[PDB]
Amino acid sequence: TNDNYIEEVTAKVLTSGKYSTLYPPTVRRVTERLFDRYPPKQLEKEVRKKLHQAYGAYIGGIDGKRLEKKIEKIIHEIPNPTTDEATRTEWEKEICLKILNLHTSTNERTVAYDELYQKIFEVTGVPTSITDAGCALNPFSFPFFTEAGMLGQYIGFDLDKGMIEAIEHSLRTLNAPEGIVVKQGDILSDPSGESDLLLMFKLYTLLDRQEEASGLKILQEWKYKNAVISFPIKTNYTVKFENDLVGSDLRIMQKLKLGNEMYFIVSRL
């Protein structure tokens, strides 16, 4: 009956309409972390308390059907008549660039996609695959990392299943390559996995906010040839990260500044 409270509390948080479409393992993790330091009773109050704070941010505002409506309108407005490879490739970028302009996460990076992956791959080399943690609308970035040379598999994941379903239905409308895969996941709660190139765009601070010292732990647990970690330029939090690396056994291979974001390319060698 020790692990029951954890499962009962999490099931009660999930069955309710508020924190419904939220990756269940994420709910279990918070619940399992708070159970070690707060009384079994009234845990449901404090788990919800931390969901309103750290997890309420990307869950609030994102409406699954609403997102798909805006994306599906953008695709039908601009027509897709027969043309040349080069021109259709520029059309594919035009639409994907508008889709990226929808949510805040990828709005500011649209100026950089034109050459973001080209610049990242100069350092890391062309990866055989990309894992994109907390992907948001970044899967619609395939036109750019594809011309940059990455024709392998892309596995993007985020917390909201409503968003991810909208992305999957949208990607099929664009006749996207079968290698552009989206699923739901949480790099914080899911088991540590392997990758070639791991992308953590605007996630390190959010991760430390959701759970202390988690971001650095994840970078040491996950196996990857290289990993890209993005931070905004609100002028603070970026210095805290490069300070965290001093103690770890990780290495900064390159530090790139594109648009209004600083990208750190980290490696185990």
Side-chain angles (χ1 to χ4, degrees):
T1 316
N2 193 9
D3 299 38
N4 290 7
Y5 285 96
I6 293 177
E7 191 61 28
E8 289 180 357
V9 171
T10 62
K12 187 173 292 182
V13 170
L14 294 164
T15 188
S16 60
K18 287 66 176 180
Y19 309 99
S20 60
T21 311
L22 178 60
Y23 190 56
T26 301
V27 177
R28 159 174 276 272
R29 186 178 191 79
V30 176
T31 307
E32 187 166 28
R33 165 166 281 271
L34 301 176
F35 180 79
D36 299 17
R37 58 180 176 180
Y38 295 105
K41 297 182 179 181
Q42 304 186 6
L43 181 58
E44 183 182 5
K45 289 185 173 62
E46 298 188 9
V47 61
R48 279 196 166 189
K49 183 172 62 178
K50 194 163 190 178
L51 295 180
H52 171 84
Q53 294 174 352
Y55 300 95
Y58 283 88
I59 280 52
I62 287 61
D63 179 3
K65 188 182 181 182
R66 186 185 187 89
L67 183 58
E68 186 178 340
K69 287 181 183 180
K70 301 187 72 178
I71 298 174
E72 291 293 341
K73 187 174 183 179
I74 290 172
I75 301 161
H76 295 103
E77 281 182 327
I78 309 180
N80 186 23
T82 185
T83 185
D84 186 14
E85 172 282 331
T87 55
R88 185 185 55 76
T89 294
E90 295 302 325
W91 169 86
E92 191 76 333
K93 289 182 180 61
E94 184 186 345
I95 287 182
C96 284
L97 204 64
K98 291 189 174 187
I99 295 169
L100 291 159
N101 287 318
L102 293 174
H103 286 289
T104 186
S105 179
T106 61
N107 187 4
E108 302 185 23
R109 177 165 42 258
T110 56
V111 180
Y113 287 116
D114 297 15
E115 61 185 7
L116 176 58
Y117 299 100
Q118 298 180 350
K119 289 183 176 299
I120 290 172
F121 306 159
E122 287 183 11
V123 177
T124 70
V126 177
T128 66
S129 51
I130 299 182
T131 295
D132 190 7
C135 69
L137 298 177
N138 196 49
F140 298 97
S141 178
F142 68 89
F144 307 96
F145 65 78
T146 294
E147 65 171 5
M150 206 300 292
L151 284 47
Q153 192 166 43
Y154 170 93
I155 297 175
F157 58 81
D158 203 340
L159 310 178
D160 192 354
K161 198 179 69 174
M163 164 176 286
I164 293 173
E165 187 173 10
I167 296 179
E168 184 171 336
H169 188 262
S170 294
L171 287 171
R172 179 58 180 88
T173 302
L174 282 52
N175 298 318
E178 58 189 334
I180 308 302
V181 184
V182 300
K183 61 170 185 177
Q184 63 179 340
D186 178 5
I187 197 171
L188 177 57
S189 61
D190 284 322
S192 54
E194 302 190 35
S195 304
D196 183 329
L197 184 57
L198 173 54
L199 307 181
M200 294 180 62
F201 300 150
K202 296 188 181 182
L203 189 64
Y204 192 89
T205 59
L206 178 56
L207 287 170
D208 287 350
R209 181 182 180 182
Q210 292 170 359
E211 176 175 326
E212 187 175 13
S214 59
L216 182 59
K217 191 176 188 299
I218 289 173
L219 296 176
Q220 296 174 190
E221 289 180 324
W222 275 71
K223 294 182 179 180
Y224 50 80
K225 303 281 65 176
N226 290 295
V228 184
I229 316 180
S230 183
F231 296 95
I233 303 178
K234 306 179 185 301
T235 179
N236 183 19
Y237 280 103
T238 186
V239 59
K240 178 175 176 297
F241 164 78
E242 49 194 336
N243 182 14
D244 289 344
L245 301 175
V246 176
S248 68
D249 196 2
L250 301 183
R251 282 179 164 273
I252 302 179
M253 307 307 302
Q254 183 66 4
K255 184 178 176 178
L256 301 172
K257 177 189 174 185
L258 291 168
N260 191 34
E261 301 184 25
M262 193 67 58
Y263 301 81
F264 293 81
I265 298 178
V266 180
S267 183
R268 305 288 281 94
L269 56 61

